[PDB]
Amino acid sequence: SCKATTGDSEFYDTYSITACRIDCETRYLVENCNCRMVHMPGDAPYCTPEQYKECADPALDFLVEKDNEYCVCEMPCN
């Protein structure tokens, strides 16, 4: 069951990683920010916008600098 919504790459298996980065941030945000994003699926309690954007700003700018490789994923099942 290592499939996904085909229709992204011709050879490269990025479609599989595209999902990793998603769940990767979901844990990074909920970790300290303890809040999900507007694009994030139903899970954590939606926090106010004032704090959501105020926390998301540094959250991403932080994980993007530090969590550069940590947010790496491997190709799908072959």
Name the residue ranges covered by the structural domains of the chain.
15-63
* 52-58 own/partner pairs: CB under 8 Å, 24+ apart: 55/29, 56/29
Rounded Cα distance, 5 and 51, in Å: 33
Task: List all residues 6 or more positions away from 19 whose beta carbon is below 8 Å from its beta carbon.
Answer: 4
Task: List all residues 6 or more positions away from 8 whose beta carbon is below 8 Å from its beta carbon.
Answer: 14, 15, 18
Rounded Cα distance, 44 and 13, in Å: 29
Which alpha helices (DSSP H) does 1-78 contain, by range?
15-32, 49-63
Q: How many CA atoms are closer than 13 Å to the CA of 12, on its beta-carbon side? A: 6
Burial tier of 25 (Cβ tally within 10 Å: 0-12, 13-18, 19+)? buried
In the CATH scheme, what is the homologous superfamily, with its name and number, of domain 15-63?
Answer: Acid-sensing ion channel domain (1.10.287.820)
> How was this entry determined?
NMR
